[PDB]
Amino acid sequence: SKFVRKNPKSDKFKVKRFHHIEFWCGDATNVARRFSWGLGMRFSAKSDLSTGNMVHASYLLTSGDLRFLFTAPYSPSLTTTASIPSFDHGSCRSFFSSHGLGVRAVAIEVEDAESAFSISVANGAIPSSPPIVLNEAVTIAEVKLYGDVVLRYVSYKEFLPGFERVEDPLDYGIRRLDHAVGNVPELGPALTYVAGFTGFHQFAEFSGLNSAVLASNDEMVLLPINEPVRKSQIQTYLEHNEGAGLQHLALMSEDIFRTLREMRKRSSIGGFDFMPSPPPTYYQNLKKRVGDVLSDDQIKECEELGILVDRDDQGTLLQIFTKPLGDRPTIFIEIIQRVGCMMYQSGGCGGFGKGNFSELFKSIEEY
Amino acid sequence: SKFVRKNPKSDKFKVKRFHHIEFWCGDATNVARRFSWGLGMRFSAKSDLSTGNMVHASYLLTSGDLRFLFTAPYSPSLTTTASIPSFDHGSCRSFFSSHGLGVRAVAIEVEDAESAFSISVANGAIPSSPPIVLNEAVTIAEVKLYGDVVLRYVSYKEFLPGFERVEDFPLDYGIRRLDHAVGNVPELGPALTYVAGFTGFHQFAEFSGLNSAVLASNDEMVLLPINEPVHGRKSQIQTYLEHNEGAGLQHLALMSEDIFRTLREMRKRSSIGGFDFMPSPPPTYYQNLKKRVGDVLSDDQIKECEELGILVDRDDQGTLLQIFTKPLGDRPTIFIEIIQRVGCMMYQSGGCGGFGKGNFSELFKSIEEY
Numbered sequence: 209s210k211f212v213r214k215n216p217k218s219d220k221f222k223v224k225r226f227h228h229i230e231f232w233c234g235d236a237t238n239v240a241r242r243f244s245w246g247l248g249m250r251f252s253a254k255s256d257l258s259t260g261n262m263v264h265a266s267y268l269l270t271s272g273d274l275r276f277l278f279t280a281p282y283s284p285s286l287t288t289t290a291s292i293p294s295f296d297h298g299s300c301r302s303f304f305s306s307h308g309l310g311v312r313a314v315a316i317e318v319e320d321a322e323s324a325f326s327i328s329v330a331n332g333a334i335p336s337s338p339p340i341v342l343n344e345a346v347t348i349a350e351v352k353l354y355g356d357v358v359l360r361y362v363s364y365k366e367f368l369p370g371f372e373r374v375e376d377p378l379d380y381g382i383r384r385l386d387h388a389v390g391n392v393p394e395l396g397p398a399l400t401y402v403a404g405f406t407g408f409h410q411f412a413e414f415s416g417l418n419s420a421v422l423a424s425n426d427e428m429v430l431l432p433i434n435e436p437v438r439k440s441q442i443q444t445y446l447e448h449n450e451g452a453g454l455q456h457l458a459l460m461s462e463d464i465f466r467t468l469r470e471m472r473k474r475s476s477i478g479g480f481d482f483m484p485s486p487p488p489t490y491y492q493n494l495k496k497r498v499g500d501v502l503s504d505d506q507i508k509e510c511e512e513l514g515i516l517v518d519r520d521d522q523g524t525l526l527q528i529f530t531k532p533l534g535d536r537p538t539i540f541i542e543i544i545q546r547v548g549c550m551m552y553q554s555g556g557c558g559g560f561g562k563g564n565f566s567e568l569f570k571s572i573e574e575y
Numbered sequence: 576s577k578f579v580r581k582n583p584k585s586d587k588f589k590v591k592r593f594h595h596i597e598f599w600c601g602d603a604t605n606v607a608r609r610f611s612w613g614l615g616m617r618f619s620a621k622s623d624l625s626t627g628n629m630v631h632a633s634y635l636l637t638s639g640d641l642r643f644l645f646t647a648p649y650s651p652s653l654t655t656t657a658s659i660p661s662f663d664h665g666s667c668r669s670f671f672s673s674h675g676l677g678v679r680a681v682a683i684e685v686e687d688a689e690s691a692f693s694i695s696v697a698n699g700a701i702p703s704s705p706p707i708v709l710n711e712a713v714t715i716a717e718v719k720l721y722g723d724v725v726l727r728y729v730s731y732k733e734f735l736p737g738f739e740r741v742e743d744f745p746l747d748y749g750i751r752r753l754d755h756a757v758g759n760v761p762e763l764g765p766a767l768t769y770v771a772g773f774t775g776f777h778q779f780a781e782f783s784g785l786n787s788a789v790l791a792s793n794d795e796m797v798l799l800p801i802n803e804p805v806h807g808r809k810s811q812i813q814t815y816l817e818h819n820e821g822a823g824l825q826h827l828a829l830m831s832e833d834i835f836r837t838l839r840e841m842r843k844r845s846s847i848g849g850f851d852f853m854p855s856p857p858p859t860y861y862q863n864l865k866k867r868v869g870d871v872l873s874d875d876q877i878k879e880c881e882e883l884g885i886l887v888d889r890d891d892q893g894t895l896l897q898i899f900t901k902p903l904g905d906r907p908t909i910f911i912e913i914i915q916r917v918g919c920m921m922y923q924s925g926g927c928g929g930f931g932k933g934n935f936s937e938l939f940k941s942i943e944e945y
């Protein structure tokens with residue numbers, strides 16, 4: 209009848225929001241051009257040859273507050289010209305040879321990046337890049353998160369110094385990043401490592417995996433982690449990804465129907481593909497499950513677009529998943545819309561979809 | 576008053592057509608998805624994990640007879656499961672680390688691929704992959720062309736054994752075939768005598784920052800131009816050799832059956848995934864058009880070129896429409912030429928109208944005016 213969560217607010221430094229995500233590429237132009245058309249993200253800021261960067265090409269896509277950065281290295285024959293100081297040509301080709309197209313950096317806005325970096329290392333974090341102050345404007349620092357992903361700290365005194373603003377329409381309703389999930393071999397150690405240096409508390413849950421969720425004090429920076437337990441997808445991931453790494457990004461949309469009707473039109477002409485849709489029983493069982501949250505027309509709309517729906521104690525959740533973004537069966541995208549919990553709306557409203565494993569199964573047991 | 580052309584038909588083996596072009600990628604899925612939407616090429620055949628290939632992912636785009644192959648390597652921890660036998664994981668990462676996104680293979684249909692390979696090596700060609708017979712169906716062989724590009728020989732007894740046909744309503748911007756494939760090289764003389772030395776390709780005569788000869792097969796339908804940098808405004812070909820870390824393919828020219836359609840489609844998509852184009856010639860250029868190709872293009876077709884930014888050139892045999900994209904990837908190296916040829920219809924003879932060498936001048940004296 210009642211579910212109660214706790215929140216010690218045990219953050220070891222002041223954390224604000226997700227700042228951006230840095231993909232590492234072989235050729236960043238094509239990847240950014242496809243992501244832009246397939247997700248509806250505007251070309252916003254560049255740091256390439258045309259801006260004078262002879263170390264790496266970096267292209268930034270935005271939609272709402274969501275910031276996808278796409279970095280690919282230039283030839284070593286053409287350091288000081290790189291806008292992102294923590295970039296190394298060799299670490300980049302190693303990452304792409306080993307893991308392929310994937311997320312390098314999970315970056316978050318924090319009060320002071322040297323403050324965050326100092327405590328993190330002192331509380332166990334493995335350092336990657338120390339605090340570099342860019343033009344006395346932004347501070348940047350990187351610690352190891354899981355595998356070859358880095359948690360990157362960004363703090364302030366069009367995106368970073370050295371980037372040039374790209375002026376211009378494209379917009380499918382995606383407004384912000386919601387959570388970023390990492391697949392690791394052993395949950396226990398990875399969980400005690402990350403929470404050990406961030407002070408992130410565990411967000412409670414209302415298969416082939418085990419999943420805990422680490423969260424900041426206001427529960428707006430959400431970092432779930434999966435463990436491998438039909439062969440487990442997480443295990444397949446660890447093989448094709450040659451280790452631990454970010455599994456999926458969840459992108460909050462202000463209207464999942466719009467974003468899906470846009471993203472679905474473009475699946476065959478450049479965009480992104482989606483998982484095969486649940487059996488029609490699933491949406492018939494919707495009417496007596498979230499019928500007091502979604503109208504019947506909104507339920508018909510989910511069946512047309514293949515959207516999963518889940519509920520927990522505080523709210524209701526709409527969500528759908530793409531197919532792997534690149535060549536390897538590794539990283540994919542989650543589109544979500546959260547309903548309820550509007551105090552502002554509290555993050556994690558509706559959970560993460562853990563219930564859909566069952567409900568989707570017993571949809572297939574029927575039918 | 577008169578330009579006369581010769582043709583010794585000195586081919587050392589039987590050569591038919593351009594078969595396909597193999598790009599080497601870091602991630603072939605995104606590159607092929609972008610090229611498909613930005614050029615209007617249909618997803619036709621795959622050889623990835625979903626077909627059982629654990630060495631490399633290969634995705635084929637088509638439009639008319641044009642075949643763009645996009646290959647990217649999988650992890651070595653998962654040779655026998657690879658559909659393309661000449662693929663090596665290390666040669667691929669070396670290529671992409673060194674040159675970035677570029678063309679690996681220029682492949683052409685020939686009568687017998689072991690026949691072509693044997694003579695080529697015997698006439699100087701540097702071998703890369705010997706003749707491998709796939710499922711007693713198609714033969715494949717590769718010799719070095721320029722730098723790390725390979726001339727690949729393909730002969731027959733959806734695309735290769737091991738590939739699975741992709742059913743698609745379908746995208747199509749009017750591109751129908753590949754016209755020519757150009758390589759930038761440090762020294763023209765040696766590269767020219769090397770390639771023609773083992774193919775027997777004759778020189779196609781020409782009616783800047785570069786020196787350009789054109790090597791051609793007997794029917795002048797497989798066209799392989801080569802550029803050289805002229806030193807001492809800095810030569811683009813020289814900049815290419817720096818960013819490309821050596822010689823390599825510079826541009827592919829894609830014949831369209833209607834360059835206006837193909838560009839009104841391709842320009843719509845420049846800002847939403849597709850390809851961008853060079854800044855348009857000054858309006859004087861298109862004014863001088865009316866008394867230059869006015870007996871070939873109507874006034875409406877001339878206004879249409881000004882709207883789409885198309886260059887026009889003429890030679891002894893015919894007239895040429897052409898326009899160039901910006902570099903396809905991160906590096907200022909490889910780009911695309913869209914072309915439509917007019918005249919010379921005996922069938923239409925390749926090289927009709929030349930290649931645009933006159934436009935350097937016409938473009939300039941347009942800017943000297945205005």
Ligand SMILES: O=C1CCCC(=O)C1=C(O)c1ccc(C(F)(F)F)cc1[N+](=O)[O-]
Pocket residue numbers: 387389419432433434456516529542560561562564565568
């Ligand atoms: O948000 C999360 C984090 C923990 C792992 C997880 O299961 C979550 C999902 O994004 C999610 C939700 C539902 C489904 C299902 F079962 F409907 F397919 C799948 C996922 N998932 O793993 O991407």
Ligand SMILES: O=C1CCCC(=O)C1=C(O)c1ccc(C(F)(F)F)cc1[N+](=O)[O-]
Pocket residue numbers: 757787800801802826886899912930931932933934935938
């Ligand atoms: O087709 C060729 C091969 C030889 C070299 C060459 O210049 C050709 C062109 O594709 C061409 C023609 C005209 C222009 C101009 F005038 F616009 F600059 C440029 C090129 N080009 O991109 O090489």
Ligand SMILES: [Fe+3]
Pocket residue numbers: 387389456458542560
């Ligand atoms: Fe999720």
Ligand SMILES: [Fe+3]
Pocket residue numbers: 757826828912930931
């Ligand atoms: Fe050309």
